[PDB]
Amino acid sequence: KTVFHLGVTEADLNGATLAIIPGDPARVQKIAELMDNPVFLASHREYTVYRAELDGQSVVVCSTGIGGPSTSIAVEELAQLGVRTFLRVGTTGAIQPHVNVGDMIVTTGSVRLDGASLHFAPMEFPAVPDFDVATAMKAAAQESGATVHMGVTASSDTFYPGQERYDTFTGRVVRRFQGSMKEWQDMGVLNFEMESATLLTMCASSGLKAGCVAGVIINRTQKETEARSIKVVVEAARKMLK
Amino acid sequence: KTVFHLGVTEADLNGATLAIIPGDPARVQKIAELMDNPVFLASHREYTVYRAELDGQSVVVCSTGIGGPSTSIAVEELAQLGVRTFLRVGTTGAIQPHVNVGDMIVTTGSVRLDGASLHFAPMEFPAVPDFDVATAMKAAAQESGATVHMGVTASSDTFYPGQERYDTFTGRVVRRFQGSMKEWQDMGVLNFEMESATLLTMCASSGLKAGCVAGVIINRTQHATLKETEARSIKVVVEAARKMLK
Amino acid sequence: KTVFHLGVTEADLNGATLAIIPGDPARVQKIAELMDNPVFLASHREYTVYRAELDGQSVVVCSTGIGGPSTSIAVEELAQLGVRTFLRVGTTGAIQPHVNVGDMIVTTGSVRLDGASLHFAPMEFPAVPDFDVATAMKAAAQESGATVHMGVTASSDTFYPGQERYDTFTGRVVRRFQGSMKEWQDMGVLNFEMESATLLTMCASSGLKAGCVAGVIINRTQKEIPDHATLKETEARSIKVVVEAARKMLK
Amino acid sequence: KTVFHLGVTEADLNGATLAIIPGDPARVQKIAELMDNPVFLASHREYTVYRAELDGQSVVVCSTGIGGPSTSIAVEELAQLGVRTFLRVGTTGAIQPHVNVGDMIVTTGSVRLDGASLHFAPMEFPAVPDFDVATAMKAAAQESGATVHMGVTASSDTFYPGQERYDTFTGRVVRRFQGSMKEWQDMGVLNFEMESATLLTMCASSGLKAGCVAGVIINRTQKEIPDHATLKETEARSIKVVVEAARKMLK
Amino acid sequence: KTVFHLGVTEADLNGATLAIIPGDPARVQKIAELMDNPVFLASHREYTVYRAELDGQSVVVCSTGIGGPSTSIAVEELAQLGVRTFLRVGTTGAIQPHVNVGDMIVTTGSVRLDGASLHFAPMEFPAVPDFDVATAMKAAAQESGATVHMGVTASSDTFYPGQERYDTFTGRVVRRFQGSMKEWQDMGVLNFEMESATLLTMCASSGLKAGCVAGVIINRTQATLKETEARSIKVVVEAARKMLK
Amino acid sequence: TKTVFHLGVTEADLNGATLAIIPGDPARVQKIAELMDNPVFLASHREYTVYRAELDGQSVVVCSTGIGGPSTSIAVEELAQLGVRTFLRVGTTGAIQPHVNVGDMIVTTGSVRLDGASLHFAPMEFPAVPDFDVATAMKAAAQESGATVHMGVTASSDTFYPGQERYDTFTGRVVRRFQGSMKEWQDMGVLNFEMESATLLTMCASSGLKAGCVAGVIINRTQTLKETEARSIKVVVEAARKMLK
Numbered sequence A: 001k002t003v004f005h006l007g008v009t010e011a012d013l014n015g016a017t018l019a020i021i022p023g024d025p026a027r028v029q030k031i032a033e034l035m036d037n038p039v040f041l042a043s044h045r046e047y048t049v050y051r052a053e054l055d056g057q058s059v060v061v062c063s064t065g066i067g068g069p070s071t072s073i074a075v076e077e078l079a080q081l082g083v084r085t086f087l088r089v090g091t092t093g094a095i096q097p098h099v100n101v102g103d104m105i106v107t108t109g110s111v112r113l114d115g116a117s118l119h120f121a122p123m124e125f126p127a128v129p130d131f132d133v134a135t136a137m138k139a140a141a142q143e144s145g146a147t148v149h150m151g152v153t154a155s156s157d158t159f160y161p162g163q164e165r166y167d168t169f170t171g172r173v174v175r176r177f178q179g180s181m182k183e184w185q186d187m188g189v190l191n192f193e194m195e196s197a198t199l200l201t202m203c204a205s206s207g208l209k210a211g212c213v214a215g216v217i218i219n220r221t222q223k224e225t226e227a228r229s230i231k232v233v234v235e236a237a238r239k240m241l242k
Numbered sequence B: 001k002t003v004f005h006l007g008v009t010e011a012d013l014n015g016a017t018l019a020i021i022p023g024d025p026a027r028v029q030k031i032a033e034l035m036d037n038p039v040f041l042a043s044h045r046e047y048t049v050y051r052a053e054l055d056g057q058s059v060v061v062c063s064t065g066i067g068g069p070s071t072s073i074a075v076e077e078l079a080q081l082g083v084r085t086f087l088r089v090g091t092t093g094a095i096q097p098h099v100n101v102g103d104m105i106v107t108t109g110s111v112r113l114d115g116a117s118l119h120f121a122p123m124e125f126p127a128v129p130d131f132d133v134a135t136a137m138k139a140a141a142q143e144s145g146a147t148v149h150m151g152v153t154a155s156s157d158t159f160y161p162g163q164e165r166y167d168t169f170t171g172r173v174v175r176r177f178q179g180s181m182k183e184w185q186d187m188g189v190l191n192f193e194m195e196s197a198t199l200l201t202m203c204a205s206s207g208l209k210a211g212c213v214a215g216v217i218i219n220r221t222q223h224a225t226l227k228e229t230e231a232r233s234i235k236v237v238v239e240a241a242r243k244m245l246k
Numbered sequence C, D: 001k002t003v004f005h006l007g008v009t010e011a012d013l014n015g016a017t018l019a020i021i022p023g024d025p026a027r028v029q030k031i032a033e034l035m036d037n038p039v040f041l042a043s044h045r046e047y048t049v050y051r052a053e054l055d056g057q058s059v060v061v062c063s064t065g066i067g068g069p070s071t072s073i074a075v076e077e078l079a080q081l082g083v084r085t086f087l088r089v090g091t092t093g094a095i096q097p098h099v100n101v102g103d104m105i106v107t108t109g110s111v112r113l114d115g116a117s118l119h120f121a122p123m124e125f126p127a128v129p130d131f132d133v134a135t136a137m138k139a140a141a142q143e144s145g146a147t148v149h150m151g152v153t154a155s156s157d158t159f160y161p162g163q164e165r166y167d168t169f170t171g172r173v174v175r176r177f178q179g180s181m182k183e184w185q186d187m188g189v190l191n192f193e194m195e196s197a198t199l200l201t202m203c204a205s206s207g208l209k210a211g212c213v214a215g216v217i218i219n220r221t222q223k224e225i226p227d228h229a230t231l232k233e234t235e236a237r238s239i240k241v242v243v244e245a246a247r248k249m250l251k
Numbered sequence E: 001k002t003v004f005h006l007g008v009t010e011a012d013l014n015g016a017t018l019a020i021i022p023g024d025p026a027r028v029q030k031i032a033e034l035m036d037n038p039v040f041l042a043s044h045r046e047y048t049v050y051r052a053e054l055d056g057q058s059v060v061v062c063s064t065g066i067g068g069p070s071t072s073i074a075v076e077e078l079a080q081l082g083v084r085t086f087l088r089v090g091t092t093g094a095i096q097p098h099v100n101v102g103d104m105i106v107t108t109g110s111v112r113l114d115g116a117s118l119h120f121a122p123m124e125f126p127a128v129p130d131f132d133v134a135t136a137m138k139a140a141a142q143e144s145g146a147t148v149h150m151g152v153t154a155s156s157d158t159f160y161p162g163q164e165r166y167d168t169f170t171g172r173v174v175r176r177f178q179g180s181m182k183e184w185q186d187m188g189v190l191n192f193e194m195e196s197a198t199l200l201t202m203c204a205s206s207g208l209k210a211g212c213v214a215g216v217i218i219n220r221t222q223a224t225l226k227e228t229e230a231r232s233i234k235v236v237v238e239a240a241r242k243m244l245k
Numbered sequence F: 001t002k003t004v005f006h007l008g009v010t011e012a013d014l015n016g017a018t019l020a021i022i023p024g025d026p027a028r029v030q031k032i033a034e035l036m037d038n039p040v041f042l043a044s045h046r047e048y049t050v051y052r053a054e055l056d057g058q059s060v061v062v063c064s065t066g067i068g069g070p071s072t073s074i075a076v077e078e079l080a081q082l083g084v085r086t087f088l089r090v091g092t093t094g095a096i097q098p099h100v101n102v103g104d105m106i107v108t109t110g111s112v113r114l115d116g117a118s119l120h121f122a123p124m125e126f127p128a129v130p131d132f133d134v135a136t137a138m139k140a141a142a143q144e145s146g147a148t149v150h151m152g153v154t155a156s157s158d159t160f161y162p163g164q165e166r167y168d169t170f171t172g173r174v175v176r177r178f179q180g181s182m183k184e185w186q187d188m189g190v191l192n193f194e195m196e197s198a199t200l201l202t203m204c205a206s207s208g209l210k211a212g213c214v215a216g217v218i219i220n221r222t223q224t225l226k227e228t229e230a231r232s233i234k235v236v237v238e239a240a241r242k243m244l245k
């Protein structure tokens, strides 16, 4: 009746079938306060589970922590409780020069540089969002006033070598990832983040709806964004309740 | 002079930046005839080529033949002649019982059960269409009055074992594909075809816009209406093309 | 028994057990005209099927279109209708400086740079031709007055990046195939083409006998530019060779 | 200019070159408060950081959050601030019958069911603890009076399908992991966890010392839920072992 | 410098450009005995080397030992010493019921169930004999009187699980190889052995000629040991003769 | 009532032996068993020389494995069928770290699986690691001999040449996979190259058998002493003794 990690029950969600899933537990309260009567439900480790109401419908806000592994946990347990739509909000780093800090990235597809996506569908299966969620997100983003890019997102199990950072303890990137950033760029990939591949694959392959939206905070080639980011997702969420 | 396979020049396209790419050459004339001023350009192997006009703009219509390799050739040479947008069109068989014959499947992503996609991007790259193209296609498809499904398509390099068919010469399916049909169905995969993985990956990784839409003519949850769904299918890809052009 | 794609029946074949399978439909007519009383059986998509008699014996000639996916459908449906032997003929580009435009290459194994071969057997399985088809083919090739090479062919699902061509729209090649031409060269690979890996693997793993012979129409290593005389000559040669190979295979 | 995620500087570590890295942030204070002069340093996200002293040497305790990605970040950033030794403590579920609740598992190697390890070394590289750290944990564990097992831990990027759980929303396990648990049992594997393949591989291939010890609180081969005073006892003991093990690693 | 494992010099070979490479060091002397002027050269580990002559020309017989790594070493070092052509000979157990005891199999290609081949060429590359060697081997086998099969050989890094043997210490076979024998059986694979994938791939990818011929002494699905052995080595020496003239 | 296929021995012949020392060279077997009591020739077929000896009153096996995981996995499988449960690899090796000197001892705590045969026992993800007691016992025997001792990762290769990135060979070619590879393993702290540990360790750890590897440094590519060869088998014999108590 009560899930293993989130420590909540189905009655707790008051029939919520949509969750906004940031990674940061501190984003959780703040997102809920762009909605109504935010109720604390549980807080175990990186998962802080809040209920709130949005346009007179119950919705979940659940932090996921960092990485596909912690994410796959939150999504599975919430789905056990009836949740069917999962909205990913956060911030990202752009790798295309034409993309500016302030812009929103809505993922049309994730490059699968993770491990947990593989635990749901084999590698040939695409990491793709639900079209309705991506649509709602694009719309909500455009209406916000921001410049908006639809495109492919590289989703990496690491922050440093998998995103080809050299400014690290050993200054070394494993062979697979050497020259990788330039490869994604010439392939038109827009950004690097760390959760969308597991999110989109586990959802696309398990009859769940998911999408990813994110604000550009750094550009490896070249606040208002963070605030307009959760603003954009709460509105994307609104659009999704039809 | 001309591109190596298609046998057309950039002059023949008359400034076309959008191509419609049906699989079978026999349908090329039908599609071009839904537009303004059809003209036959050439026929070489499985590449039958026509030029037409849509709202005052040139449009190429070009068959691809079957499978990722001949598709990869058409799309490459087309791109050399200035095409930047590709709308794939055809008829398909669904594998999800809730999908009726007559409906339109607009592919949001493809399972890469091909070889040619790996020649453009490693297996981790998503085989996804351009958002604008999938958006026009869904718009066009709904406009035609049919029910529309956006979802995943399994793109195989073979018609038989890769689509786990046992009624064959050997009766045999290689380990990789035994149980695969039920695996895809459980994963929500909508249908099978054989060029979308190669198309979507080559274009997504090369600065090109691509999309697929198909009419369901049969359900593997086992037709008569083949002619009609086809007609509806190419009307939709011509309307999607118009939306993409303006 | 009308097969799904080729749309012919076993009757249509008259007991034919051997097929010659070019890629181009246009070449099916000419291979036929090297044999007797050509019978158009069907034509759907890139698949053009013809019965013809060679040495008083019924033999199919079937176009396969470009690529393993297209080829596997054609071989599968032929095989459902009694064909046990298949001879691939075509053109190829050589990557060894000692191989001249106009020579004949008979494939002894293919590098599997394709996807359809995997739908019949795992990568560890060798894409190898039937020993008798390769023997007959080499013999036919010598007898026709051409220089003949036996060896490994790299068989690619693409004509462009998988054969490391940079003269393309993007002008770039994915990591896997970056530097790959020089690697095949250093390994003794003779040439590139697009269908041998799927054919050989599927046939070798399915109790079908098969082989591939191609005429060299370009050498990426030779600065020389060939002509149209020897071009037309060695394509006429190749299909003339593939018919003498088939004859040797019949008895 | 603190590290991006962790929110600490090298001066806050006070010259510490050893870290205890539990998964749960709620445990960091408890671990620190077994040492001398524990101070709260920072808490961002799932990263809760404390400092303490052990026998006259500064020690850091930093939580990692669930999974390889979250762990790799903590480890990388801890190393940038000078940490060269990483000791993982936690509780776990053993998949072998002969392994009992309250026992200690000390990992000598990890099956790599993660993705983050691959970002440091290719799959061929073993996910191996530092011999001195694993030696130090075996000694600490034994002296605690508990039964100790040295063996293989299966380390999965998921808690459900990748540990072959069927009690889930879809009830589905992907082919790769169907039958996998019996495979691991047959191969002598002691337990599932979710962070050891990444940590071990990252450290082994990066000039850092790491090892893993966990307390067995439940056995999946056994129906029962164990005594819930054994829960806290095993838990209390688990951190008493890694603190003693850490003291051994110093000196 | 001089060859590290083999313990012979290029001079010791007296210009030999062809080697006959058996697995068992015990068969080296007897292969060499069928040829003119047999001479013991060296014995280090699994590597027993002899020289002999075939119609005026020097030949080496060098045992390889068991498995691809041992074989990769011998071939490489013989290659350093001037060898260009390698004829593998031996005995085998068929897995096709239609292949009878005393028949000869000539490998036209190997399934790469090995690791060492990957040290010479990616998996996509075919483990395939030289056409000339396989043709000479066919002809020598045919001329012997034995029924001759040209086909695919499965080449395994293990004798036990990778050939799907369950009569073992664990009784257990890893997933990749569960049901694998039937699969090879269905695909037409003629037999199992343990060195050909490594030999064929490293030769085919390094400008060396090579082939494999083997006598069928037993069938998995179902005197002769002495007899098939003799026929097998007479076959390879005749093959070696054809290759030199 | 049963003789193993390759080794040609029975469980009776082992006299209750549950421990084997397993070097490469059969010539080392007689060397190793000379450090022990009442050596007994059990068999020799191909590259497998099998000796029973008594060590500190207990029955113990010494068995050569030849070169490579394939040959080695057969030896281990068949000894395991005969009750052997603990395996001690001894050998020579070549370091790739400058601080490691000729004459040092390396105890393998993990192997990079650059082999094929490991895969026949467990998927690639499974760690090729030694039993802890054996590694510990070996470290102990190594330090007690006076020599300098390193614990760490070993790169374990199905080839002597291209998979250890040697270019001093017939072709001078190294396949892409192993191009740049020595520098990669050097950067990852890898200690040494050899050719059997991955197969041995993976097969044993996945089959409920205990094993470990100790080797004497005879070369450093970034920079044989008979003393260090003798050191090596004395340590392994002494490691065995600590394993028997």
Ligand SMILES: NC[C@@H](N)Cn1cc(F)c(=O)[nH]c1=O
Pocket (backbone or CB within 6 Å): F024, F067, F092, F093, F094, F095, F160, F164, F193, F194, F195, F218, F219
């Ligand atoms: N006989 C050589 C081999 N079995 C052990 N070895 C010794 C070396 F020095 C080396 O660099 N690589 C090896 O594999």
Ligand SMILES: NC[C@H](N)Cn1cc(F)c(=O)[nH]c1=O
Pocket (backbone or CB within 6 Å): A066, A091, A092, A093, A094, A159, A163, A192, A193, A194, A217, A218
């Ligand atoms: N703390 C980082 C989050 N995991 C997402 N993210 C954000 C970036 F800016 C970035 O460059 N990379 C990235 O992964």
Ligand SMILES: NC[C@H](N)Cn1cc(F)c(=O)[nH]c1=O
Pocket (backbone or CB within 6 Å): C066, C091, C092, C093, C159, C163, C192, C193, C194, C217, C218
């Ligand atoms: N039209 C191309 C055919 N697929 C065969 N071919 C021909 C070449 F010249 C060539 O360089 N590559 C190649 O594959």
